[PDB]
Design a protein around this motif. Structure first.
Motif, mmCIF file in Angstrom:
data_model
loop_
_atom_site.group_PDB
_atom_site.id
_atom_site.type_symbol
_atom_site.label_atom_id
_atom_site.label_comp_id
_atom_site.label_asym_id
_atom_site.label_seq_id
_atom_site.Cartn_x
_atom_site.Cartn_y
_atom_site.Cartn_z
ATOM 1 N N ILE A 74 0.774 -1.124 -0.034
ATOM 2 C CA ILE A 74 -0.039 -0.054 0.054
ATOM 3 C C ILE A 74 0.885 1.242 0.043
ATOM 4 O O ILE A 74 1.721 1.347 0.847
ATOM 5 N N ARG A 75 0.659 2.118 -0.879
ATOM 6 C CA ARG A 75 1.767 3.141 -1.150
ATOM 7 C C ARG A 75 0.941 4.374 -1.423
ATOM 8 O O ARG A 75 -0.153 4.650 -1.942
ATOM 9 N N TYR A 76 1.508 5.443 -0.484
ATOM 10 C CA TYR A 76 0.877 6.714 -0.692
ATOM 11 C C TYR A 76 1.826 7.776 -1.259
ATOM 12 O O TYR A 76 3.025 7.493 -1.245
ATOM 13 N N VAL A 77 1.391 8.756 -2.096
ATOM 14 C CA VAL A 77 2.108 9.568 -3.133
ATOM 15 C C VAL A 77 1.705 10.968 -2.857
ATOM 16 O O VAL A 77 0.312 11.130 -2.704
ATOM 17 N N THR A 78 2.347 11.992 -3.168
ATOM 18 C CA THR A 78 2.179 13.340 -2.875
ATOM 19 C C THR A 78 1.913 13.993 -4.234
ATOM 20 O O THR A 78 2.661 13.947 -5.134
ATOM 21 N N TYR A 79 0.509 14.498 -4.514
ATOM 22 C CA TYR A 79 0.200 14.818 -5.832
ATOM 23 C C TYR A 79 1.031 16.105 -6.380
ATOM 24 O O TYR A 79 1.568 16.702 -5.413
ATOM 25 N N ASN A 80 1.101 16.209 -7.561
ATOM 26 C CA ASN A 80 1.819 17.296 -8.297
ATOM 27 C C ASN A 80 1.330 17.380 -9.746
ATOM 28 O O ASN A 80 1.223 16.610 -10.296
ATOM 29 N N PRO A 81 0.840 18.584 -10.088
ATOM 30 C CA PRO A 81 0.137 18.700 -11.507
ATOM 31 C C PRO A 81 1.408 18.829 -12.522
ATOM 32 O O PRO A 81 1.251 18.993 -13.614
ATOM 33 N N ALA A 82 2.928 18.705 -12.009
ATOM 34 C CA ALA A 82 3.712 18.695 -12.881
ATOM 35 C C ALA A 82 4.995 17.419 -12.867
ATOM 36 O O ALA A 82 5.927 17.736 -13.417
ATOM 37 N N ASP A 83 4.494 16.599 -12.348
ATOM 38 C CA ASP A 83 5.141 15.342 -12.116
ATOM 39 C C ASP A 83 4.466 14.064 -12.430
ATOM 40 O O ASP A 83 2.877 14.055 -12.262
ATOM 41 N N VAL A 84 4.908 13.290 -13.077
ATOM 42 C CA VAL A 84 4.120 11.986 -13.217
ATOM 43 C C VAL A 84 4.585 10.945 -12.349
ATOM 44 O O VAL A 84 5.911 10.457 -12.137
ATOM 45 N N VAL A 85 3.594 10.180 -11.929
ATOM 46 C CA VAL A 85 3.842 9.244 -10.918
ATOM 47 C C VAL A 85 4.127 7.762 -11.672
ATOM 48 O O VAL A 85 3.403 7.240 -12.384
ATOM 49 N N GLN A 86 4.862 7.101 -11.066
ATOM 50 C CA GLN A 86 5.595 5.728 -11.436
ATOM 51 C C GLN A 86 4.558 4.693 -10.846
ATOM 52 O O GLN A 86 4.279 4.850 -9.730
ATOM 53 N N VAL A 87 3.823 3.473 -11.788
ATOM 54 C CA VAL A 87 3.070 2.695 -11.206
ATOM 55 C C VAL A 87 3.823 1.388 -11.596
ATOM 56 O O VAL A 87 4.031 1.097 -12.703
ATOM 57 N N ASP A 88 4.027 0.708 -10.271
ATOM 58 C CA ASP A 88 4.481 -0.736 -10.669
ATOM 59 C C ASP A 88 3.604 -1.899 -10.399
ATOM 60 O O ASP A 88 2.686 -1.923 -9.476
ATOM 61 N N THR A 89 3.202 -2.775 -11.575
ATOM 62 C CA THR A 89 2.181 -3.700 -11.490
ATOM 63 C C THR A 89 2.883 -5.107 -11.825
ATOM 64 O O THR A 89 3.706 -5.021 -12.769
ATOM 65 N N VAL A 90 2.474 -5.873 -10.990
ATOM 66 C CA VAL A 90 2.810 -7.290 -11.219
ATOM 67 C C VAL A 90 2.026 -7.978 -11.867
ATOM 68 O O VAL A 90 0.731 -7.661 -12.121
ATOM 69 N N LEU A 91 2.096 -9.344 -11.997
ATOM 70 C CA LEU A 91 1.417 -10.109 -13.112
ATOM 71 C C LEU A 91 0.036 -10.644 -12.007
ATOM 72 O O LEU A 91 0.375 -11.434 -11.155
ATOM 73 N N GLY A 92 -1.011 -10.154 -12.507
ATOM 74 C CA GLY A 92 -2.221 -10.725 -11.820
ATOM 75 C C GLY A 92 -2.797 -10.211 -10.608
ATOM 76 O O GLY A 92 -3.430 -10.960 -9.883
ATOM 77 N N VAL A 93 -2.554 -8.910 -10.319
ATOM 78 C CA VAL A 93 -2.899 -8.525 -9.027
ATOM 79 C C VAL A 93 -4.041 -7.369 -9.550
ATOM 80 O O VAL A 93 -3.707 -6.596 -10.593
ATOM 81 N N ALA A 94 -4.862 -6.923 -8.615
ATOM 82 C CA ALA A 94 -5.645 -5.585 -9.014
ATOM 83 C C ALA A 94 -5.186 -4.525 -8.249
ATOM 84 O O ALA A 94 -4.996 -4.327 -7.065
ATOM 85 N N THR A 95 -5.013 -3.492 -9.169
ATOM 86 C CA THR A 95 -4.660 -2.049 -8.589
ATOM 87 C C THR A 95 -5.254 -1.208 -8.530
ATOM 88 O O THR A 95 -6.350 -0.992 -9.399
ATOM 89 N N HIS A 96 -5.519 -0.699 -7.084
ATOM 90 C CA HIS A 96 -6.685 0.218 -6.611
ATOM 91 C C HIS A 96 -6.234 1.593 -6.680
ATOM 92 O O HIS A 96 -5.306 1.891 -6.043
ATOM 93 N N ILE A 97 -6.978 2.368 -7.348
ATOM 94 C CA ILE A 97 -6.783 3.964 -7.289
ATOM 95 C C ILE A 97 -7.918 4.452 -6.657
ATOM 96 O O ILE A 97 -9.053 4.080 -7.025
ATOM 97 N N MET A 98 -7.716 5.364 -5.511
ATOM 98 C CA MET A 98 -8.715 5.956 -4.831
ATOM 99 C C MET A 98 -8.399 7.432 -5.192
ATOM 100 O O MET A 98 -7.395 8.028 -4.949
ATOM 101 N N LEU A 99 -9.583 8.176 -5.721
ATOM 102 C CA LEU A 99 -9.692 9.459 -5.905
ATOM 103 C C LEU A 99 -10.100 10.127 -4.631
ATOM 104 O O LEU A 99 -10.906 9.544 -3.775
ATOM 105 N N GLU A 100 -9.825 11.536 -4.531
ATOM 106 C CA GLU A 100 -10.293 12.253 -3.300
ATOM 107 C C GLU A 100 -11.809 12.377 -3.500
ATOM 108 O O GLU A 100 -12.285 12.495 -4.592
ATOM 109 N N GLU A 101 -12.675 12.657 -2.462
ATOM 110 C CA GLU A 101 -13.941 12.998 -2.460
ATOM 111 C C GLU A 101 -14.252 14.173 -3.308
ATOM 112 O O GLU A 101 -13.653 15.015 -3.530
ATOM 113 N N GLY A 102 -15.305 13.713 -4.165
ATOM 114 C CA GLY A 102 -15.969 14.935 -5.127
ATOM 115 C C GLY A 102 -15.131 15.190 -6.219
ATOM 116 O O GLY A 102 -15.181 16.289 -6.984
#
Lengths: 49, 28, 246, 246, 49, 246
Positions: free
Chosen positions: C13-41
């Motif tokens: 489980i990983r937390y990252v600090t948002y930024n409109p000027a950077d792209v976040v790296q996503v590490d995905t392994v074979l056969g797991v479900a990647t969950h993205i939670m957006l902020e409310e609203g």
């Protein structure tokens, strides 16, 4: 059985208010009065109005 | 032969200052 | 390329600090479900893949589910919402290790905005309550049915306050003209125990009624001059600006 | 990884406490359906498997059943609800032993809140009962028909009470104005045997009627000042706050 | 609960204005009045009109 | 050719200034989807590729999504909008390095035109407020119910003003003929605190009315000549032009 007797005003609880506007019935219009005294709940512990 | 009765008019004899004490909400 | 910070219990489980000027790296392994939670609203608009068939996409509201379904998936995601647009750099993990189960965003921009406007009401409320640089006039006479008398009356040059004892029935107030004609005046109720009624005018006369009982109030020092409401607020410290623009 | 703690009755029955920042190790064996309870009243939004074909998912409100249905199932499970988001690491156990028949969640937050609310409720009840800060006035005389006279009468500066014996019909209570015109005030029955009629005002006079018999009550220590109600409740020990906020 | 009591007016807030157009009711027409007293919000803190 | 400069954090996010006299260079690699952001409130009409098949174009609102589907993706993008048209040179990059995850425009044209319009409005407002070459008349007179009289009255040669004490009600002002009839006149309320009422005619006589009380204002120096209003507006330094032509 009532839900929460400490936050409820039941039917038949008389409020006493003072009529702010002079009322003339010739034309249909609306009126306005102000409560003079706080009104408590049916259990009589909390001022709701 | 009849008009709307006027509401009670208060007498103007017993005149007293309203504020016997300084009100506390004045921070006084 | 922010790598999200591992949760202390589990690195999956990983937390990252948002930024409109950077792209976040996503590490995905074979056969797991990647969950993205957006902020409310966040109102989801649309997204885009580098390979629509590489990753499996399911969304309902602020929840985004990502899953690789094709081997050797090195693509990217651009998801757009009404507020912002999140960017990701997807690398397929080849060893099924260092899996990341869910990503959560920290938004310093929203914190900065809300903290500032929280201070905005802080200043507004402080200015309202402070009410320093205001004068009080107490010279008031009285006559009539004394039983409904207000225990105290005073004016601040803008309003006029009447107060009553805790056992006193709150009466009505009518604004009196020079000729003796009664007319309405807007009243607001303030005070600790609703024992203060404030009328929105200063007048050399007032009259108080209840039932068939009456009472008159005289302002012995009615000052017609007063202080102009230079700001359109009850305080001299709250400027009132036109938001609507147009 | 949170490995659940087994029950002292059987190792197949285990418990796990929730934590937002960790996953749960689910070791299923083949041919068994793993039982889940979500907590009371939580509403399901979405779930996600690594291999939807690896496991079978049954949801009936707050009930979840999962079982492997494909050999070598090692994926992750995330079921999301309104209040939180859940995490599992699905791993099939190859020897068909030490299965997890059911999992039960323990929640620190909601258990504490339920405990805290009961704490506050008990404190409120005790504060109302203790009835400290009371001054009682007794200078009351009566005039008229003694048949429906109360056997006791007093007030506490906020409410006015009356008591009648068990053999008398409870009459009505009427607030008398300065002029002599009756009117209504609310009345609440209290007491061990419902022999106490309490009215919500303090007045110099009161009127008592039943049938064509009438009675008057006179207050001789009518304090106009009373005590201000800084709290908005029946007692000076209970605060009343605006939970609506908004 | 009202949203923002600093920026709102409710039923019963009696305005007061001086009538400009001498009213005669034979034909239907229009009327005009100018507000005399600054009206404050329900919070009694801000001049709205 | 304009080449965008990347953001300092990531080399994938590049910022560039729009210009109608040159075409943006876009360096796309295989496996990335580029996010293009139009100006807020811009209205897209249509677009054009060199190869409609080479790149996919999905658009909702002001957002443009592209990705090459075929090798040697070397064509052009010409998208037209209501306010302008954007131009791109999509060049395929065979090394799959140095991606273009996005592209955001810094428009000089819109803010450049805005500054000019704000400058023009500022000049207009300065012309109104400067108010030079104004002569003032103060010889004014009253008779009647003084209690609602204005604190001050004067005319600029065109308009007549009345200032009222901030505690007094705002009265209604009527025009008076030489005969004795009364006529409505348009009034505009000016000043910092809305305590100055302005009527739009310089006249020998005025009547002010409120309730049952009246006051007649007399001008002692009514000058029939006045000042010609040859510029069509309250200012002598602002004209009014017929832009509609025809």
């Amino acid at each position: 059985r009532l839900g929460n007797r400490d936050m409820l005003i039941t039917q038949g609880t008389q409020l006493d208010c003072v009529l702010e506007t002079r009322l003339v019935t010739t034309q249909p219009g609306m009126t306005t009065c102000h409560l003079t005294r706080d009104v408590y709940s049916t259990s009589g512990r909390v001022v709701l109005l | 032969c009849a008009s709307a009765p006027k509401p009670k008019q208060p007498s103007d004899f017993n005149r007293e200052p309203v504020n016997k004490t300084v009100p506390v909400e004045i921070q006084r | 390329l922010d790598v999200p910070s591992s949760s202390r219990y589990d690195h999956r489980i990983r937390y990252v600090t948002y930024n409109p000027a950077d792209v976040v790296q996503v590490d995905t392994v074979l056969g797991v479900a990647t969950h993205i939670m957006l902020e409310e609203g966040e109102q989801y608009l649309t997204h885009a893949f580098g390979d629509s068939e590489a990753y499996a996409f399911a969304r309902k509201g602020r929840h985004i589910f990502i899953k690789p379904q094709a081997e050797l998936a090195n693509t990217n995601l651009i998801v757009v919402t009404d507020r912002r647009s999140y960017k990701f750099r997807l690398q397929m993990r080849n060893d099924r290790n260092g899996a990341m189960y869910e990503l959560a965003f920290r938004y310093p921009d929203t914190q900065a905005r809300q903290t500032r406007e929280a201070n905005a009401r802080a200043a507004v409320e402080a200015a309202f309550e402070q009410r320093v640089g205001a004068y009080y006039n107490l010279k008031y006479m009285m006559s009539g049915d004394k039983d409904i008398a207000p225990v105290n009356a005073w004016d601040d040059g803008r309003f006029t306050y009447f107060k009553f004892s805790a056992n006193a029935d709150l009466p009505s107030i009518y604004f009196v003209d020079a000729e003796g004609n009664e007319s309405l005046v807007p009243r607001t109720t303030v005070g600790s125990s609703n024992n203060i009624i404030a009328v929105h005018k200063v007048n050399p006369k007032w009259m108080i009624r209840l039932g068939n009982r009456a009472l008159a109030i005289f302002n012995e020092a009615y000052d017609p001059n007063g202080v102009p409401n230079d700001t359109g607020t009850a305080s001299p410290a709250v400027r009132r600006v036109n938001k609507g623009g147009n």
